[PDB]
Amino acid sequence: MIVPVRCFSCGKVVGDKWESYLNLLQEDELDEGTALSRLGLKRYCCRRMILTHVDLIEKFLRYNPLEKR
Amino acid sequence: NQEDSMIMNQSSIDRGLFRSLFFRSYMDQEKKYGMSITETFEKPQRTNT
Amino acid sequence: RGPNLNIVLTCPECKVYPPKIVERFSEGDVVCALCGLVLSDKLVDRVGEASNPLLDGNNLSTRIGKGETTDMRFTKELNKAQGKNVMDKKDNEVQAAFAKITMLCDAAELPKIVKDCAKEAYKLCHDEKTLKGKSMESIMAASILIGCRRAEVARTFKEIQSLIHVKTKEFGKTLNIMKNILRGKSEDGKIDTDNMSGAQNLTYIPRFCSHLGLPMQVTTSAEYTAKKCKEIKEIAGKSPITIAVVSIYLNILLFQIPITAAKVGQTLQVTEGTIKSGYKILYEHRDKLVDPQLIANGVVSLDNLPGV
Amino acid sequence: KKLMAQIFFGPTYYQRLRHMVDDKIHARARGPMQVLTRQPVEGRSRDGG
Amino acid sequence: TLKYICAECSSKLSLSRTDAVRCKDCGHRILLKARTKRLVQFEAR
Amino acid sequence: FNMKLAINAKTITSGLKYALATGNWGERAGVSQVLNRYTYSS
Ligand SMILES: [Zn+2]
Ligand SMILES: [Zn+2]
Ligand SMILES: [Zn+2]
């Protein structure tokens, strides 16, 4: 639903690169392969972690909160 | 992994691989057995129940 | 007046009476909680049919119908023979009454609890010397009224009269008789609460407002006005229907909804003159008939209510 | 040490199915019996045999 | 009394065993029991 | 004559509800089933 903290296979931290990945795609007009390598993700285990992630939390945040303070 | 079994990485499992949420819902009603007998949602005590 | 035939589980060793007993259902055991001795083992936890022994008592019956292979001749004659049973004739009268009560309650869009209470009221009040010169329509209409009141969804006499054709006098006498019967069997054999009282006007307002299509805010204001309307002696003696209708009308003009009294009285079957006549009484005490919060916020001001 | 053979190695899309063992494992030493036949009841959820 | 929350207007209510199950503000007939205020412990594994 | 009793709305309401709650198309079986919601493709 949200970006995983670590790569499943090797455990490298990838949860601090989602916004950097999106910004590279949007403003720098980079292809996803170049963006993945620019972020330092070399092993294809780490590349698929960020490349295949679906950000569902953005969909869940469209519903109004159940309990507002 | 012989005969259609597989080996999974415990480290990958620890990091969240193929982990899922399970939800179960329980339903209950306050039935009225006619005009006299009726139920209520209560915390029963061992001395009256 | 009969053989005991009662089994009581107690620990022979502990001898403490009454005993602490635990039912290990998962293990199928009844064990003494103090010593652990097992007192009974192999305890038990479509092949049958269900029935309610409160509306039908003890009456087991089976229907006759077609199968995968059947000749119409046998079915017709077997039904013909089964109908001519003298003992089952008595209870069929009650069942027929239940069928018509169900039809009336279903054509009225009433909840299942209402019809169950109505049928139970009929059974308890039926077969008695008091209700023998009264028409069955009065019995059914009175039972439905009782059933609705027991369910906290009470209706009015006119609303029930819309379906069951019984004039007021017979309706009232039957209702008084049945209430006495239920009270009589409540003492010797509960029945009523604050709801059983006739007025209970607050229950009518939500449905009356719905017929007019008002928003829920107006309905709540109408309930508050009707609740406080009982402090005025000049209106407190009026019928609960008028008390609720005039309160609703007062709020209709308070929030400035464009619905005239000509239609409010036409929808709730109340004379327009009565509505306006009562509205005049509910104008000298307006400060006590409007919720303090609503006026405090600014949603409603008392100068929007015309004054004669 | 190197494996004498070389391994076919890469990503593949796998799915977690609905069948989990913790929802199937069940044993019974003794337990409730049916009212009619007085034999063990049916169903893991009811401590059956 | 115990505290509930409306499922549409998110208004916090306080109902007793006698009060009807309904929002006194908007009129919704579904209420959510408020989360318990005692701390709950979770392992980070 | 009371038109409110001549026409029983319960007839239409129950027949459609019963036939849709169960699969029993009458008054054929398995015509209505509880929709799978295990996953979107399901
Ligand atoms: Zn990796
Ligand atoms: Zn003992
Ligand atoms: Zn609300």
From Swiss-Prot, chain A:
Q: Which keywords accompany this UniProt record? A: DNA-directed RNA polymerase, Isopeptide bond, Metal-binding, Nucleus, Ribosome biogenesis, Transcription, Ubl conjugation, Zinc
Pfam families (UniProt xref): RNA_pol_N
Q: Name one GO cellular component term.
A: RNA polymerase II, core complex
Job of this protein: DNA-dependent RNA polymerases catalyze the transcription of DNA into RNA using the four ribonucleoside triphosphates as substrates. Common component of RNA polymerases I, II and III which synthesize ribosomal RNA precursors, mRNA precursors and many functional non-coding RNAs, and a small RNAs, such as 5S rRNA and tRNAs, respectively. Pol II is the central component of the basal RNA polymerase II transcription machinery. Pols are composed of mobile elements that move relative to each other. In Pol II, RBP10 is part of the core element with the central large cleft.
Give the family per the record. Belongs to the archaeal Rpo10/eukaryotic RPB10 RNA polymerase subunit family.
Question: Mind telling me which HAMAP family this protein's record contains?
Answer: RNApol_arch_Rpo10 (MF_00250)
Q: Which gene encodes it?
A: RPB10
The record's misc note reads:
Present with 5300 molecules/cell in log phase SD medium.
Q: Can you say what this protein is called?
A: DNA-directed RNA polymerases I, II, and III subunit RPABC5
Q: Signal: is it a keyword of this entry? A: no
- Where, by residue number, does Zn(2+) bind? 7, 10, 45-46
Cross-referenced NCBIfam families:
PRK04016.1
* GO MF annotations in UniProt: DNA binding; DNA-directed RNA polymerase activity; zinc ion binding
Swiss-Prot record, chain C:
The UniProt entry, under SUPFAM superfamilies, shows: Cyclin-like, Zinc beta-ribbon
User: Do the record's keywords include Nucleus?
Assistant: yes
Location(s) in or outside the cell: Nucleus
What InterPro entries does the record tag this protein with? Cyclin-like_dom, Cyclin-like_sf, TFIIB, TFIIB_CS, TFIIB_cyclin, Znf_TFIIB
Q: Record-annotated residues binding Zn(2+)?
A: 11, 14, 32, 35
Q: Which domain of life is it from?
A: Eukaryota
GO molecular function list = RNA polymerase II complex binding; RNA polymerase II complex recruiting activity; RNA polymerase II general transcription initiation factor activity; TBP-class protein binding; zinc ion binding
Q: Could you tell me the keywords of this UniProt record?
A: Metal-binding, Nucleus, Repeat, Transcription, Transcription regulation, Zinc, Zinc-finger
Matches recorded under SMART domains? CYCLIN
User: What are its GO cellular component terms?
Assistant: nucleus; transcription preinitiation complex
- Biological process per Gene Ontology, one example term: RNA polymerase II preinitiation complex assembly
Residues in sequence repeats: 104-180, 208-284
ZnF endpoints (TFIIB-type): 7-40
Remarks, miscellaneous: Present with 6750 molecules/cell in log phase SD medium.
User: Quaternary form?
Assistant: Associates with TFIID-IIA (DA complex) to form TFIID-IIA-IIB (DAB-complex) which is then recognized by polymerase II.
Q: Which family does it belong to?
A: Belongs to the TFIIB family.
What is this protein's function? General factor that plays a major role in the activation of eukaryotic genes transcribed by RNA polymerase II.
Q: What is this protein called?
A: Transcription initiation factor IIB
Curated annotation (Swiss-Prot), chain D:
Q: Where in the cell is it found?
A: Nucleus
Could you tell me what this protein does? DNA-dependent RNA polymerase catalyzes the transcription of DNA into RNA using the four ribonucleoside triphosphates as substrates. Second largest component of RNA polymerases II which synthesizes mRNA precursors and many functional non-coding RNAs. Proposed to contribute to the polymerase catalytic activity and forms the polymerase active center together with the largest subunit. Pol II is the central component of the basal RNA polymerase II transcription machinery.
Tell me what else is known: The binding of ribonucleoside triphosphate to the RNA polymerase II transcribing complex probably involves a two-step mechanism. The initial binding seems to occur at the entry (E) site and involves a magnesium ion coordinated by three conserved aspartate residues of the two largest RNA Pol II subunits.
Q: What is known about its subunit structure?
A: Component of the RNA polymerase II (Pol II) complex consisting of 12 subunits.
By sequence similarity, the record places it as follows: Belongs to the RNA polymerase beta chain family.
Q: What is this protein called?
A: DNA-directed RNA polymerase II subunit RPB2
Q: Which organism is it from?
A: Saccharomyces cerevisiae (strain ATCC 204508 / S288c)
First and last residue shown, out of the full length, are: 1079 to 1127 of 1224
Swiss-Prot record, chain E:
**Positions of the zinc fingers (C4-type)?**
6-26
**Entry PTM:** The N-terminus is blocked.
Q: Which GO terms describe its molecular function?
A: DNA binding; DNA-directed RNA polymerase activity; zinc ion binding
Q: Which GO terms describe its biological process?
A: nucleolar large rRNA transcription by RNA polymerase I; ribosome biogenesis; RNA-templated transcription; termination of RNA polymerase I transcription; termination of RNA polymerase III transcription; transcription by RNA polymerase I; transcription by RNA polymerase II; transcription by RNA polymerase III
- Annotated Zn(2+) binding lies at 6, 9, 23, 26
Q: Where in the cell is it found?
A: Nucleus, Nucleolus; Peroxisome
Domain of life (superkingdom):
Eukaryota
Tell me which UniProt keywords the record has, alphabetically: DNA-directed RNA polymerase, Metal-binding, Nucleus, Peroxisome, Ribosome biogenesis, Transcription, Zinc, Zinc-finger
> Has keyword Plastid?
no
**Chief location category:** nucleus
Query: Does the record carry Metal-binding as a key word?
Result: yes
Q: One Gene Ontology cellular component annotation?
A: nucleoplasm
In the record, the note on similarity to other proteins reads: Belongs to the archaeal Rpo12/eukaryotic RPC10 RNA polymerase subunit family.
On subunit structure and binding partners, the annotation says: Component of the RNA polymerase I (Pol I), RNA polymerase II (Pol II) and RNA polymerase III (Pol III) complexes. Component of the RNA polymerase I (Pol I) complex consisting of 14 subunits: RPA135, RPA190, RPC40, RPA14, RPB5, RPO26, RPA43, RPB8, RPA12, RPB10, RPC19, RPC10, RPA49 and RPA34. The complex is composed of a horseshoe-shaped core containing ten subunits (RPA135, RPA190, RPB5, RPO26, RPB8, RPB10, RPC10, RPA12, RPC19 and RPC40) where RPA135 and RPA190 form the DNA-binding cleft.
**Further remarks about this protein from its record:** Present with 907 molecules/cell in log phase SD medium.
What range of the intact protein is shown? 26 to 70 of 70
